[PDB]
Design a protein around this nucleic acid. Structure first.
Lengths: 24, 61, 212, 37, 146, 171
RNA sequence: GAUAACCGCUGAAACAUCUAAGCGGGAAGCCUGCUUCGAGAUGAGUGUUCCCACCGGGUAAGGCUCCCAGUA
RNA sequence: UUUGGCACCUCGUCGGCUCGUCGCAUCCUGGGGCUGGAGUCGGUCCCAAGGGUUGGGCUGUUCGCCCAUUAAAGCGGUACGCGAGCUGGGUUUAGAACGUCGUGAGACAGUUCGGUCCCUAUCCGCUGCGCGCGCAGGAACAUUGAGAAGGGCUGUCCCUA
RNA sequence: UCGAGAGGGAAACAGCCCAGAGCAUCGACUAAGGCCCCUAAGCGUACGCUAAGUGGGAAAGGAGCCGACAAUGUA
């Protein structure tokens, strides 16, 4: 499959927030 | 105007007609500005509008 | 309707032989001893029910909120609590002990417990779907669900359609299991059948909901 | 009972009555029971 | 000059009790929705809630004209296929009268995020007793004008 | 309503009380009550009156009077419905207040007597149902006759006393 | 428990009428009853017990993190 | 839901498998009226969509015929449901042959043998699992139930006889 | 009339009803269409009809009614 639309800035950043490291 | 007029027991339907028959035409812009702040003045205007109406309002003109 | 109940712990299965020499595969349930810790009522709590506390736990692993809830009924702290939704909860009393022999031979019970877990079960194993055949040239879909809806009308997958998800490890209630024998010395219950959950689980045994 | 939009008397004893918004014919000869619908 | 728009503190909500004893259901809802929406006082604005709390006692004795009691349904679909479940008002008004009056008033109000805030000011009860006795509610009769 | 116009007569020994629209008649056999539907009114001369001449008013006129007359007869003399049993082996026995029926079934039928309704057994093919309320007496008799409808080939089952069943020539 | 077709009691409008006021019976169907989820039911509920009235911060009851594991 | 007419949107047809979902014009099961219904079984009609509705031979086949059963082997809509789910047997490419047509290149709702079925799921949707916050003191435990999902099939023999 | 036509009404709905937008206006009167609540204005006054939610779809025909009857979910 292929992305139907360019992802809106809000939606892109909602997700990348989840890609965070944990404090040891 | 309709809310304030119904507080004094006259519907907006006929409060306007009475005002016409008293030649006291005063814009709605400011006729609604009296109801909020100066209730007495609006109360004094419904009195005029009620007495300027015909006795029986539904009889043939 | 009146419902007697008791917590147990499935221990395993074995077989017995009734007087007519008919193999009867039974499951050994170590039910009891369990004590009433609280009795609900229409006025205090709205409905009629009865807690019973079964288990063995040293007083050092019980936090104070529960350690004070047990001291109201004056019973040593147990580890598992449950309610039996009954209709005669006014006949119980705090601290009353419900022994294993609440049931007698022949009575039918409704055993309940957490079924065994199965992980993220696939389509076939969890809904008994069929496949697309191993042979005759099936391209990488030997175990696929198949289709999941129609074309542009409705253009949407219906809610409640059967997919693959986490199976098992959910509450299950087997019904009208027969209580073969009640060995009151050890406090066991020989029940003809297969109660839910793995060995060591916390089963509940209450009287037949049906047939009353 | 015969279900027909056209409900008519067949003999004299037939009585045309209106029950529950539906016109039916009641008669001693059970064959003449008729209901409109 | 600019026409007065009420600020948060110009509103002084009151409490009205509408005894619905043998009063038409539709005329109960319209009267309750007028008060709820705050559309009877000169401080009305279309973007702020100015209405008054409306308690409703005797919500089980709403008179219903004609064959409505046995013909009018109340449909409710769940999302799953074949999930439509309807209820005759004979059944609905028998054991859940409050849930039928509150549904009627809900329809007679905006379906936006403010109409749901207005609708929270309407308490419906089946008896003659409402717990809201500390709010000093004022009985509210239903009257017409000339 | 030609029926409604007719005045009502109250035999001696009957106490009639009219409290608004509800009439309570006390007789030697019991007491009955009824709320008359509006706008029909009743006055003691008993004469039933109607406000207007509307279609519905006329119907209610006659209906209301007929109910009232029934009570007066019902509390004075009462209603008895006779039922006869025809067939082979069909008998009726009275067990206290209940009736045992054997209409050719695998098990016997025990019909209970509703409050205010008594049963009389003259014979094991003839019985009557006595009572004060006409509707209830008729209801019980109909229910007892529903146990075994009368066959159209041999007229087997319970039937009303003197009720002429049409017989079909079995082919 | 209420109902469909249907079967009736009483009964007019006008003797008859299961109906126009009323009252019953009557389906694997409808609501319950059985199993499971279920207060994000933002209307966010209820119960028993515990902590105790400190100075942005330290804490009580009680948690979380970490380690050994499975009944996961 | 057929064979058609219009040409208004847009320059892999079918069949099978998998998975559903809905309508009732009901095949079975449930209730009932009438019967040219003695009984068993039927015919017709009325109510009824909860569940159920087998396996094979022939053909690509839908269809259809047949075999053995079954309480029954229902009719339809959903892009004649469903190929970003599978097959690829017929059908709409290129090879070759037969019949017929054509002077010939070739053609035929004639036939015959062979003949590449791509994609890492962004959005909605669906199946499961977490994180955050909320629910005006903070917690542990057990629960009411507004609502929702699941299940609803049926046969043979004995007694009554 | 649209095409090349904005604005109001018919729930949405180029072609239907009203009406032809130079620009501003927190004044007034009206057109089609409306005046129980959503939503501006009548729970208008008076007489009469309808009992079918007819109004809020339909025929031959039968005695406002029946005739009336498809598929995602009231529709």
């Amino acid at each position: 499959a292929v992305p139907k639309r360019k992802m809106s800035r809000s939606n892109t950043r909602h997700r990348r927030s989840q890609w965070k490291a944990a404090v040891p | 105007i309709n809310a304030a007029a119904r507080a004094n027991g006259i519907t907006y339907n006929r409060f306007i007609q009475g005002l016409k028959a008293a030649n006291v035409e005063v814009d709605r812009k400011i006729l609604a500005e009296l109801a909020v702040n100066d209730a007495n003045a609006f109360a004094a205007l419904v009195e005029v509008a009620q007495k300027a109406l015909p006795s029986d309002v539904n009889a043939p003109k | 309707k009146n419902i007697k109940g008791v917590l147990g712990e499935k221990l395993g299965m074995t077989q017995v032989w009734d007087e007519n020499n008919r193999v009867v595969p039974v499951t050994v349930v170590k039910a009891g001893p369990c004590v009433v810790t609280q009795v609900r009522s229409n006025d205090t709590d709205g409905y009629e029910s009865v807690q019973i506390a079964f288990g063995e736990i040293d007083p050092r692993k019980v936090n104070k909120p529960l350690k004070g809830h047990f001291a109201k009924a004056d019973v040593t702290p147990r580890r598992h609590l449950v309610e039996i939704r009954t209709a005669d909860a006014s006949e119980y009393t705090l601290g009353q002990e419900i022994t294993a022999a609440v049931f007698e031979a022949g009575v039918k019970v409704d055993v309940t417990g957490k079924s065994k877990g199965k992980g993220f079960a696939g389509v076939m194993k969890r809904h008994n779907f069929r496949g697309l055949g191993a042979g005759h040239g099936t391209q990488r879909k030997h175990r696929s669900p198949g289709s999941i809806g129609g074309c542009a009308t409705p253009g949407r997958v219906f809610k409640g359609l059967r997919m693959a998800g986490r199976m098992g490890n959910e509450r299950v209630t087997t019904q009208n299991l027969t209580v073969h024998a009640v060995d009151a010395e050890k406090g066991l219950l020989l029940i003809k059948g297969a109660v839910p959950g793995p060995n060591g689980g916390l089963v509940l045994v209450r009287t037949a909901a049906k047939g009353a | 009972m015969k279900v027909k939009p056209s409900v008519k008397k067949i003999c004299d004893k037939c009585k045309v009555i209106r029950r529950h918004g539906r016109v039916m014919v009641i008669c001693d000869n059970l064959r003449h029971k008729q209901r409109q619908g | 000059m600019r026409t007065y728009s009420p600020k948060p503190g110009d509103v002084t909500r009151q409490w009205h009790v509408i005894d619905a004893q043998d009063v038409v259901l539709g005329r109960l809802a319209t009267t309750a929705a007028t008060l709820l929406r705050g559309k009877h006082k000169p401080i009305y604005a279309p973007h702020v809630d100015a209405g008054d709390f409306v308690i409703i006692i005797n919500a089980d004795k709403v008179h219903l004209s004609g064959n409505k009691r046995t013909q009018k349904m109340a449909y409710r679909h769940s999302g799953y296929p074949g999930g439509l479940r309807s209820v005759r008002y004979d059944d609905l008004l028998a054991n859940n009268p409050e849930k039928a009056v509150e549904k009627a008033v809900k329809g007679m109000l905006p379906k936006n995020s403010l109409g749901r805030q207005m609708l929270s000011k309407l308490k419906v009860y089946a008896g003659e007793n409402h717990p809201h006795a500390a709010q000093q509610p004022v009985p509210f009769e239903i009257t017409q004008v000339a | 309503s030609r029926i409604g116009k007719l005045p009502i007569t109250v035999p001696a020994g009957v106490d009639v009380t009219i409290d608004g629209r509800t009439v309570e008649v006390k007789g030697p056999k019991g007491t009955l009550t009824h709320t008359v539907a509006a706008p029909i009114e009743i006055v003691k001369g008993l004469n039933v009156t109607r406000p207007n001449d509307e279609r519905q008013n006329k119907a209610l006129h006659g209906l209301s009077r007929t109910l009232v007359a029934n009570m007066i007869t019902g509390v004075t003399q009462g209603y008895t419905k006779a039922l006869e049993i025809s067939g082979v082996g069909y008998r009726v026995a009275a067990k206290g207040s209940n009736l045992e029926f054997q209409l050719g079934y695998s098990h016997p039928i025990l019909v209970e007597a509703p409050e205010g309704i008594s049963f009389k057994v003259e014979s094991p093919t003839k019985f009557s149902v006595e009572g004060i309320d006409k509707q209830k007496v008729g209801e019980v008799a109909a229910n007892i006759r529903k146990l075994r409808k009368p066959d159209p080939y041999k007229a087997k089952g319970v039937k009303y006393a003197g009720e002429v069943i049409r017989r079909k020539v079995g082919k």
